Design a protein around this ligand. Sequence first.
Ligand SMILES: O=C(Nc1cncc2ccccc12)[C@@H](O)c1ccc(Cl)c(Cl)c1
Ligand SMILES: O=C(Nc1cncc2ccccc12)[C@@H](O)c1ccc(Cl)c(Cl)c1
Ligand SMILES: [Cl-]
Lengths: 301, 305
Amino acid sequence: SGFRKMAFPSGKVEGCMVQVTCGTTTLNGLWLDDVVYCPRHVICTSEDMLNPNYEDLLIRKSNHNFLVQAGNVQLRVIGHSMQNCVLKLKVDTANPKTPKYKFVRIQPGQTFSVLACYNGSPSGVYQCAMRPNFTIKGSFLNGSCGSVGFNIDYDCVSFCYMHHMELPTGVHAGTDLEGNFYGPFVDRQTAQAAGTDTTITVNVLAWLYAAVINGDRWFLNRFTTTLNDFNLVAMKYNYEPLTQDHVDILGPLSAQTGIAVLDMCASLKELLQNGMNGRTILGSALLEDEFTPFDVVRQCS
Amino acid sequence: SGFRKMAFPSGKVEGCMVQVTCGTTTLNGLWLDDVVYCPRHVICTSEDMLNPNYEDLLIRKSNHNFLVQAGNVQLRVIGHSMQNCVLKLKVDTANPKTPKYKFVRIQPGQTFSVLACYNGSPSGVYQCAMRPNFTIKGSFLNGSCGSVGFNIDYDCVSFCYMHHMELPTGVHAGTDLEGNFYGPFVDRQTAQAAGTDTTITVNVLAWLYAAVINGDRWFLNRFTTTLNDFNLVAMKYNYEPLTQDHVDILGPLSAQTGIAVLDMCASLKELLQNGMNGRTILGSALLEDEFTPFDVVRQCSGVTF
Ligand SMILES: O=C(Nc1cncc2ccccc12)[C@@H](O)c1ccc(Cl)c(Cl)c1
Ligand SMILES: O=C(Nc1cncc2ccccc12)[C@@H](O)c1ccc(Cl)c(Cl)c1
Ligand SMILES: [Cl-]
């Protein structure tokens, strides 16, 4: 029993964190096999922040300009290339702590664990969701660039995010491990704004099922709704549309608790209309949207 | 920017998790040097748990009765002893991944990270607080017994908790690594209830400072209070008393934000008597009490391990 925001154990990723220094900029790198991945903006100066030509700046760089440190050992960079917004630094040593891994690009609503690092040293691990506006609501200070988001599948680490920057609202933008940004963001100091954020409806419903599995039933009601009537109500509270894919995904939780998805959808409509009236669900006074249907099943059963 | 519930990186502890099997019971063990620590109830059966004489049950067990597995390698138990509610299994091999560590008993209100394990394999890490009623509001399923709570101080792991059981309300009870239970709990199948819980006042204040550091200032007011007037109000709302030690500990955050502790207490006093009025603090509609003053300083200043 109980329901917590749970991150994956971070050991497999800690053994990959290194410090990457280029001139005056120091950030984090991910050392997998003989390659160190890090944000390409590590090659930027003060004059290069507004409109950097990364291909031009990288061609001017030599391998000896990149200082890579794994613990108290300096690694030798024997090559450098760029893949989208990620810099790949070939090193002369394969990381002996390289876990079984994959690079996976995630969709909005998906959750992952963040290992926040500074100077190639892990300082904390927390759980995040890719917001519908493609930002992440992280906890990052200057120096955290290169910190990664990941999930663990049995023994395999799926790297899904690399931290690049903080937007003016304090939210975070980054890329997958192939250097492709999540969202309409660019690695330039040009004016960029996160789009209006919305609540991840499928995740709220998954969390309502987690609450029922844990014995919290006060919010349940005798009503059901059509999918279309639910979406018309949901949109008015800035909630993401719930698709037939989401209804299907909630099927196992629906079967386990005996509450149809459209039936839970009517509970959610009522909660949006009434609020919680001084009550809590799983110790929370707000509707939690950073637990996916997969997270709920994994944590509860 | 941002403020998250953050656990310590769990790698140093993951390299210590093993699976301990005794008869039909399988749970987790903590392998440090040549000793595997685990809850002593691993030696119990259904009848035994009802009223167990652990000294009697342990004397009947042999070293070969404890099956210890570290990954896919079986460790051989060369000795067994009991220290309070923890079983210590001497093994022939010292854990090569043993970090610098200490066993520390924590006080209520102190936070720690939990590495939840099943079958000696870590499955999740979360941050939580030792409630004033000595329970933890954890997230644990059957098979999680032996999962540990820890903090990291520089390069040293301080083990502070080992999971033993779940109380009827779904909250959790366990011991320090010396086998002493936190709270008035016993490791036996009997009627046990967690006492009425209270809010960890010093931690709420630390979290209000974290909200100010993040730009959330709507709850600040012009007023100040006394430690006595505030404690009278706090007691009324089932909040733990705030001591001069707590005021002193909140000093650095008071200095950084320019908000005196008794100034923040008057904000907390108004929040208690009036509510949030539809507003949130750090995206929460409730006052968060599972961040200590040290946690807030560590997170809002990026200390690494
Ligand atoms: O935002 C950044 N770092 C931070 C990350 N994460 C959190 C931070 C908090 C405060 C200060 C900085 C933070 C920059 O290093 C940065 C600025 C501009 C651009 Cl366009 C790029 Cl690609 C990167
Ligand atoms: O509570 C237990 N385990 C669990 C722990 N933590 C969470 C659990 C969730 C579901 C089921 C079981 C859980 C028991 O194994 C147990 C029963 C009685 C006693 Cl007196 C003792 Cl010492 C231990
Ligand atoms: Cl402090």
